């Protein structure tokens, strides 16, 4: 496992794509030694703090070692002004923006496929004991319509209430099963085609809401089948929630017959049986 260390001059910004609580993401170009190859790369500049350290390098090397189909790989890092995380550019952008823009041209197959892939990415993370802490549709990027990748895993190891599990809000106990909660919200966002969780509801009223038993509503295009899988991800007991093995297996089984589990309304109406 090898991390690339890039020069400040080897990276050239073009424009801002978006800035979060952690830092800022730049659409940039990367030029390896000489003048032959360029690249379409994304540059994450973290702003405060963390510092060129043995501790930092040790963490960056764990992230550089993360290698999946449905995880974004950390290509390299720059240090000279501040710490900058370098990543291959996903031209389609984040899944959250994608599902809103292509609402009318996304079917049941793709939606169920995204669920399988995100779960698969999370399995890898769980098997390597890396807890993501912040799994959301905005943190899943789009390589191609039928190919999404999870990003920003273990970013708290370097430095989202409505995605967080109740355990994490109160006791800050981040675990693989609290990531399952965030998965349920992530897939809910996908089913609603970019719906804002708990819309019109303040942040400080979320915990008491969840303790009464109230969860996010059944998405219009969901059958009770796929929705009960979601309901399971939001269980009060963390142990009761499904494992990422179970979720992948379930949406895989649903991906075989996709319009049996998601009803998206042609000119003709689609009629569900039970």
């Amino acid at each position: 496992a090898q991390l690339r260390i890039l020069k400040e001059t080897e990276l050239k910004r073009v424009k801002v794509l978006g800035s979060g609580a952690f830092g800022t993401v730049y659409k940039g170009i990367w030029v390896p030694e000489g003048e032959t190859v360029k690249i379409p790369v994304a540059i994450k500049i973290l702003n405060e703090g963390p510092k060129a350290n043995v501790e930092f390098m040790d963490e960056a090397l764990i992230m550089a070692s993360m290698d999946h189909p449905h995880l974004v790989r950390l290509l390299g890092v720059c240090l000279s002004p501040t710490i900058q995380l370098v990543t291959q550019l996903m031209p389609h952008g984040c899944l959250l923006e994608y599902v809103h823009e292509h609402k009318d041209n996304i079917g049941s197959q793709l939606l169920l496929n995204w669920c399988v892939q995100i779960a698969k990415g999370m399995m890898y993370l769980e098997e390597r004991r890396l807890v993501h802490r912040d799994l959301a549709a905005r943190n899943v990027l789009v390589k191609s319509p039928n190919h999404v990748k999870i990003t920003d895993f273990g970013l708290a190891r370097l430095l989202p209430i409505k995605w967080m599990a109740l355990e994490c809000i109160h006791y800050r106990k981040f675990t693989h099963q609290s990531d399952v909660w965030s998965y349920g919200v992530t897939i809910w966002e996908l089913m609603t085609f970019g719906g804002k969780p708990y819309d019109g509801i303040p942040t400080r009223e979320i915990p008491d809401l969840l303790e009464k038993g109230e969860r996010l509503p059944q998405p219009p295009i969901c059958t009770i089948d796929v929705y009960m899988v979601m309901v399971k991800c939001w269980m009060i007991d963390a142990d009761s929630r499904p494992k990422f093995k179970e979720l992948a297996a379930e949406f895989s089984r649903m991906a075989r017959d996709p319009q049996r589990y998601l009803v998206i309304q042609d000119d003709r109406m689609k009629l569900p049986s039970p």
Side-chain angles (χ1 to χ4, degrees):
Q2 288 178 16
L3 184 84
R4 282 173 172 270
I5 313 295
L6 315 185
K7 301 178 183 185
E8 198 191 75
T9 47
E10 276 196 314
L11 284 156
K12 287 195 171 188
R13 291 175 236 186
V14 216
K15 293 181 181 179
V16 184
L17 297 159
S19 61
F22 289 96
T24 310
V25 173
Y26 287 85
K27 179 188 177 192
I29 47 171
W30 168 54
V31 244
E33 290 195 22
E35 211 71 43
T36 48
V37 168
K38 309 207 206 211
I39 320 244
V41 86
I43 304 155
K44 177 100 160 178
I45 304 178
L46 297 165
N47 186 39
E48 264 54 53
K51 293 181 181 179
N53 300 13
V54 178
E55 282 199 8
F56 175 75
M57 273 305 108
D58 234 62
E59 290 297 326
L61 277 167
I62 281 176
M63 265 155 50
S65 73
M66 299 307 285
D67 179 41
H68 206 256
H70 309 302
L71 297 174
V72 175
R73 219 189 173 187
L74 183 68
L75 299 184
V77 170
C78 184
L79 314 162
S80 275
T82 48
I83 273 80
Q84 305 167 7
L85 306 167
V86 186
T87 265
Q88 183 213 1
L89 218 197
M90 305 284 150
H92 297 305
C94 67
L95 197 47
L96 176 69
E97 193 98 38
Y98 197 86
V99 299
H100 198 80
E101 197 159 40
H102 303 111
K103 196 167 184 181
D104 7 41
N105 289 327
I106 292 165
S108 55
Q109 184 70 80
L110 284 177
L111 283 158
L112 287 166
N113 282 1
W114 294 332
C115 299
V116 182
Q117 293 181 22
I118 298 159
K120 270 185 169 133
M122 289 308 300
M123 274 176 71
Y124 189 85
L125 283 168
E126 188 182 355
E127 171 67 20
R128 296 208 62 180
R129 294 164 203 179
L130 199 158
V131 172
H132 182 320
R133 278 192 78 186
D134 193 18
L135 175 68
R138 65 175 180 272
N139 284 343
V140 184
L141 307 186
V142 188
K143 184 77 166 57
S144 72
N146 190 41
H147 189 200
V148 295
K149 296 191 171 169
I150 297 166
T151 193
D152 287 337
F153 44 87
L155 206 66
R157 280 182 165 186
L158 282 68
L159 282 173
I161 305 296
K162 297 181 174 180
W163 282 263
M164 275 164 65
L166 196 48
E167 52 191 282
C168 306
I169 308 161
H170 295 300
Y171 313 105
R172 277 168 185 167
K173 198 199 178 183
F174 294 98
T175 171
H176 299 293
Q177 288 305 98
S178 56
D179 270 355
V180 174
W181 184 294
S182 292
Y183 176 87
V185 191
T186 302
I187 59 172
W188 182 88
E189 285 175 282
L190 311 186
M191 303 315 183
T192 57
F193 300 94
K196 285 157 183 159
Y198 315 96
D199 203 7
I201 300 168
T203 276
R204 287 186 164 185
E205 286 181 0
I206 297 285
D208 300 32
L209 184 145
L210 293 166
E211 291 210 318
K212 287 201 272 280
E214 299 173 43
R215 272 103 182 92
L216 288 154
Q218 177 171 4
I221 70 147
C222 276
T223 54
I224 193 69
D225 296 282
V226 276
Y227 182 56
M228 281 219 70
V229 173
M230 288 173 180
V231 166
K232 283 172 194 167
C233 299
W234 307 317
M235 291 275 88
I236 187 72
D237 183 43
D239 296 340
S240 306
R241 304 167 190 170
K243 298 273 189 166
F244 285 119
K245 312 167 185 187
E246 306 180 38
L247 299 160
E250 192 49 43
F251 294 107
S252 269
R253 197 196 65 160
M254 287 173 178
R256 291 169 163 92
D257 194 1
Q259 49 192 221
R260 201 264 201 97
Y261 294 96
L262 307 174
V263 183
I264 313 166
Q265 249 37 81
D266 178 8
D267 286 307
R268 186 184 172 98
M269 193 175 280
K270 290 176 185 179
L271 308 170
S273 340

